Each structure stands twice: as C-alpha cells, then as structure tokens.
Amino acid sequence: TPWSKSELVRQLRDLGVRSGDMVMPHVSLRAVGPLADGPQTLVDALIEAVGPTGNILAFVSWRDSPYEQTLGHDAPPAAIAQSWPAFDPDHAPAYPGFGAINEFIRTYPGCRRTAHPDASMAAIGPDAAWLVAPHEMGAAYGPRSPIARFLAHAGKILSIGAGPDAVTALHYAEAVARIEGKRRVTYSMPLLREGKRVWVTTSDWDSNGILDEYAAPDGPDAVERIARDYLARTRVAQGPVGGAQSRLIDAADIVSFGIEWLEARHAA
Ligand SMILES: CN[C@@H]1[C@@H](O)[C@@H](O[C@@H]2[C@@H](O)[C@H](O[C@H]3OC(CN)=CC[C@H]3N)[C@@H](NC(C)=O)C[C@H]2N)OC[C@]1(C)O
Numbered sequence: 001t002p003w004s005k006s007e008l009v010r011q012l013r014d015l016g017v018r019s020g021d022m023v024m025p026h027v028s029l030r031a032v033g034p035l036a037d038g039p040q041t042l043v044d045a046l047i048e049a050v051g052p053t054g055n056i057l058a059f060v061s062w063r064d065s066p067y068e069q070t071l072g073h074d075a076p077p078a079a080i081a082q083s084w085p086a087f088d089p090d091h092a093p094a095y096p097g098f099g100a101i102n103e104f105i106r107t108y109p110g111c112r113r114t115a116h117p118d119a120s121m122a123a124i125g126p127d128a129a130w131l132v133a134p135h136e137m138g139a140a141y142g143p144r145s146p147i148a149r150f151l152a153h154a155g156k157i158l159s160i161g162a163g164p165d166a167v168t169a170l171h172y173a174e175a176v177a178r179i180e181g182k183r184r185v186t187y188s189m190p191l192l193r194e195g196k197r198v199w200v201t202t203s204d205w206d207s208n209g210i211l212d213e214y215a216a217p218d219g220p221d222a223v224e225r226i227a228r229d230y231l232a233r234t235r236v237a238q239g240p241v242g243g244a245q246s247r248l249i250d251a252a253d254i255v256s257f258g259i260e261w262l263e264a265r266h267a268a
C-alpha cells in the first residue's frame with residue numbers, strides 16, 4: 001500500500017535528518033513508488049522532517065528556459081528575442097527533466113525563487129530569502145550562488161533513489177577548481193526588472209562537462225565520477241525512503257572532496 005507521510009518521516013529520521021537541518025533533495029519518484037497523496041506526501045514529509053526551523057533548497061530551473069536557443073550567440077536570435085516569455089519567478093514551472101517533485105516544492109506557500117532563470121533555486125523555510133538572493137547571471141553555481149550559501153550553512157544533500165550524476169552542488173567544485181582548460185558558455189536569459197522584459201547575456205561555466213573529456217553526452221560527467229569516488233571512500237548514512245535507496249551527504253565535505261579530486265587530475 002502507498003507510503004504515508006508519517007512512514008516517510010520515520011525513514012527520514014532514521015537516515016539522519018534532524019529538526020533544524022538544511023536539506024537539498026534529489027528524488028526519483030519512480031524508485032520511491034506510489035504515495036498516499038502523490039508526490040506531495042514526500043514534500044510534506046521533508047518539511048515535517050526538517051521542522052519549522054529547518055530549510056529546503058531545490059534546484060528547479062525553468063520548463064521554458066531558452067538555454068539551447070541562445071547558446072553560443074552574443075545576443076538572443078531575433079525570433080527568440082522577440083517572443084520568449086520573461087522569467088516570472090512566481091509563475092514559471094520547474095524544468096521537468098530534473099524531477100517531477102520540483103513543481104510541488106516551488107508552488108508551496110511561502111516558497112522563494114531565485115532570479116537566475118536557468119539555474120533557478122527554490123527554498124522553503126526561515127532562511128529561504130537569504131538562500132535565494134543574490135543569484136546573479138554569471139554566478140549560476142559558484143561563489144555568490146544559492147549553492148555557495150547552502151554549502152556555508154551545513155547543507156545536507158539528500159539523494160532519494162537518484163543516481164550519482166544528480167548532485168548539483170558539485171558544480172560549485174567545478175566553478176572554483178584550479179585546473180586548466182575549463183570550458184565556458186555564453187547564453188541569454190529574459191528576466192523581469194520593474195515589470196519590463198530585459199534580455200541579459202552572460203558567460204558562465206559549462207554545466208554539461210567542465211573539461212573536454214567530461215562533456216561527451218554518452219558520456220559520464222565529472223559530477224558522476226566525483227560523487228561515485230566519494231561514496232566509495234566515505235561513510236554516508238544509507239537506508240530506504242519509500243522504495244528508494246537513499247543517501248544523506250555532507251554537502252561541504254563532498255564539494256571539498258571534489259575540489260581536491262579535480263585538481264589532483266588536472267594541472268593548476
Ligand atoms: C533547463 N535548461 C537546461 C540547462 O540549464 C542545462 O542544464 C544543465 C543540466 O544539463 C545538468 O544536468 C546534466 O548533468 C549531466 C551530464 N553533464 C547528467 C545529467 C544532465 N541533466 C545540470 N547539472 C546537474 C544535474 O548536476 C546543470 C544544468 N545547468 O543544459 C540542459 C538544459 C535542459 O537546456
């Protein structure tokens with residue numbers, strides 16, 4: 001029979017989620033299996049698990065981000081520029097390919113949303129406003145991003161049946177890693193500034209592979225290779241959440257591991 005909220009809360013407590021914790025979930029709902037009231041039951045359990053003084057941060061992005069449509073141009077192509085919707089943080093659906101749970105997180109009453117349309121983060125809790133801003137274009141996952149502040153706030157990464165490729169915080173490791181040959185990308189996003197639609201073009205680190213050898217689509221990335229090597233070497237709390245094998249990862253520790261991992265393999 002489908003998992004109940006209190007059952008999930010018990011599993012999260014066993015895993016090491018505490019009242020006051022700041023948690024970043026990565027969830028495969030197919031692994032979890034049927035839920036009493038659908039995905040909201042797990043959203044509710046995470047909110048109950050972290051308590052009223054805890055916080056949830058999620059990488060939700062945007063269903064309609066014009067990423068591929070502007071990549072590699074110094075300006076949005078005319079047909080894109082002339083009609084694309086402005087990013088409206090309180091009305092933009094999450095990108096479905098990063099987990100169906102993100103649309104439930106981001107529509108939760110009181111949730112905050114970062115202003116980076118492609119890297120958009122969602123946060124719930126007393127620290128949500130501090131988490132989500134600033135989030136400038138050009139600072140998607142590195143210093144000054146919500147990922148950076150999460151790492152400075154004892155964040156835990158909660159992987160719920162998700163693979164080692166689904167660790168967005170490791171992009172911070174890619175951003176600051178002192179290695180040669182790091183790829184950069186240029187794209188354009190449409191923000192709303194004082195009700196006016198404004199196209200902004202910026203450059204950031206390539207989040208589809210920080211080095212040439214990691215950016216092949218067929219095709220494991222650096223995140224997957226770092227996270228798997230880390231889990232092979234580190235004691236990490238493991239156990240079920242629903243039907244999904246889950247991990248509770250110290251975010252500061254795995255990112256610090258990732259910096260050492262990349263810099264040891266590539267010259268400074
Ligand atoms: C919303 N628009 C998107 C645009 O933001 C960008 O998304 C990337 C995203 O691909 C990438 O996840 C890939 O990581 C890898 C291999 N590299 C395995 C899984 C891949 N999905 C994210 N990193 C994670 C999840 O750690 C960063 C994100 N910035 O490119 C595609 C896009 C759909 O257009």
Ligand SMILES: [Mg+2]
Pocket residue numbers: 053126127
């Ligand atoms: Mg607090």
